[PDB]
Amino acid sequence: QKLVFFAENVGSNKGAIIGLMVGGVV
Amino acid sequence: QKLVFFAENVGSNKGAIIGLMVGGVV
Amino acid sequence: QKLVFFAENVGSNKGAIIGLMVGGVV
Amino acid sequence: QKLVFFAENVGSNKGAIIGLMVGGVV
Amino acid sequence: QKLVFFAENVGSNKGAIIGLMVGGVV
Amino acid sequence: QKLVFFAENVGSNKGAIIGLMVGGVV
Amino acid sequence: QKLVFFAENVGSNKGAIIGLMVGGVV
Amino acid sequence: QKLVFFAENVGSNKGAIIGLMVGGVV
Amino acid sequence: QKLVFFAENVGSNKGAIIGLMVGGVV
Amino acid sequence: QKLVFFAENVGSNKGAIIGLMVGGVV
Amino acid sequence: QKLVFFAENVGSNKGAIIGLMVGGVV
Amino acid sequence: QKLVFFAENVGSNKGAIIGLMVGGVV
Amino acid sequence: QKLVFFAENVGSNKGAIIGLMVGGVV
Amino acid sequence: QKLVFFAENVGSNKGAIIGLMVGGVV
Amino acid sequence: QKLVFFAENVGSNKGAIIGLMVGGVV
Amino acid sequence: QKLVFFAENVGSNKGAIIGLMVGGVV
Amino acid sequence: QKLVFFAENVGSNKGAIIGLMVGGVV
Amino acid sequence: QKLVFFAENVGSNKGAIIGLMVGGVV
Amino acid sequence: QKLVFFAENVGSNKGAIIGLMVGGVV
Amino acid sequence: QKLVFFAENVGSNKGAIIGLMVGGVV
Amino acid sequence: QKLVFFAENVGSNKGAIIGLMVGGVV
């Protein structure tokens, strides 16, 4: 009903690794 | 009902890796 | 009902890898 | 009902890879 | 009902790869 | 019903590794 | 019913490693 | 019914390692 | 029914190692 | 050799979304 | 050799979402 | 060789979400 | 060689969520 | 060689969540 | 060689959560 | 070679939570 | 070679929680 | 070679909690 | 720049099933 | 830049099933 | 930049099942 994904990488050499899975609600 | 995807990479050498899957709601 | 995709890569060498899949709502 | 796709790559060597699929809403 | 596709690549060597598919709404 | 994902990495060398899976509610 | 994920790493050399799995409620 | 995950690492060299699994409630 | 995870590491060299598993309630 | 597709929606507000692909038999 | 697809939604508000793919037989 | 898909939703408010993929037989 | 999928939801408010994948037989 | 999937939910408020994956036989 | 999945929920408020994975036989 | 899964919940308020994984036979 | 899973809950308020994993035979 | 799992709860308020893991035979 | 597709089936009853898709290079 | 696909099935009853997808390079 | 796929099945009854997907490099 509401999908808010916030990811930022500032002032680094490498970035981040993000795995997000959402589902399975009755 | 609401898809808000926010991703940014500023001031780096590499970027980020983002995997996002959403679904499965009744 | 609302698709807001925000992605930017500024001041880097490489870009980012983004996989986003949304669907499966009743 | 509303498709807002925002992607930009500024000041880099490589660009980004973006895969976005949305659908499956009743 | 509203298709807004925004993509730009400025100041790079390579461009970006964007795959976007939207549909499946009742 | 409500997906709020907040992740940021600021002032580092490496980024973070985040794995998040949510689902299985009746 | 409510997913609030908060993670940040500020002023470091390395980031964090976070594994979170939630599901199995009747 | 309520997922509140709070993790932060500020003013360090290394980050933290967090493994959290919740589920199995009837 | 209520998941409140609070972990922070401030003013250190190393972070913490946290393993938390909850489930098995009828 | 035999294609029988049966789909009906009666007494509703919304209809259904059906994707069916069949092929790859030797 | 035989494709029998049966789907119906009767006496509801929303319909169903059905994805079916069959193929890869030698 | 034989595809029999049976799905029905009768006397409800919401419908069901069904994903079925079959293939990979030698 | 034989695909028999049977799913029905009768006399409810919500429907069911079914994910079925079959393949990988030599 | 034989796929028999049987699932039904009768006389309830919520439905069920079923994930079934079969494959990897030589 | 033989897949027989039997699940039913009759005369309840909530349904069940079933995760079944089978494969890895030589 | 033979998969027989039997699960039923009759005359209750809540359903059951079943996780079954089988594989790793040579 | 033979998978027989039998679980039932009849005449209760809550259901059961069953975790079964089998594999690792040479 | 032979998996026979038998569990039932009849005439109770709560169900049972069963964890069974079998594997590691050469 | 160079597309070399080689497939042959000799001395059999059935043929093969080959799906090959290549593209997405900048 | 270079696509070399080599597949052959010689002296058999059944053929092979090959799915190959390549793309997503910047 | 270089795609070399080598698969062959010689002197058998059944063939092989090969799924290969490559992509996601910046």
Added chain:
Amino acid sequence: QKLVFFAENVGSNKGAIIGLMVGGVV
């Protein structure tokens, strides 16, 4: 940058089952 896939099955009754996925490099 370099994809070398080597698979062969010689002098057998059954073939092999190979699943290979590579991608997610920045």
Added chain:
Amino acid sequence: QKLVFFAENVGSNKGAIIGLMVGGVV
């Protein structure tokens, strides 16, 4: 950057089952 997959089965009755997934490097 370099994908070298080597698998062979010679002088057997059954083949092997290989699952390989590689990705998630920044």
Added chain:
Amino acid sequence: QKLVFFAENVGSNKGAIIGLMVGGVV
């Protein structure tokens, strides 16, 4: 950066079962 997978089964009745997953490096 370097993927070297070596697996062979020679002079046997059954083959081997290999599951290999690599990823999560920053």
Added chain:
Amino acid sequence: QKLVFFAENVGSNKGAIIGLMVGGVV
């Protein structure tokens, strides 16, 4: 950075069962 997987089974009746998972390094 370097993936070297070496597994072989020579002069046996059964093969081996190998499960290897590597990842979670910052």
Added chain:
Amino acid sequence: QKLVFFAENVGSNKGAIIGLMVGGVV
């Protein structure tokens, strides 16, 4: 940074069972 997996079974009736998991380093 360096994954060296060495396993072999030579001159036996049964093979070995190896489970190896490595990860969780900051």
Added chain:
Amino acid sequence: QKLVFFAENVGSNKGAIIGLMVGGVV
């Protein structure tokens, strides 16, 4: 940083059973 796994079984009837898990270092 360095994963060296060495296991071999030579001149036997049965093989060995090895379970190795390493991780949790900051």
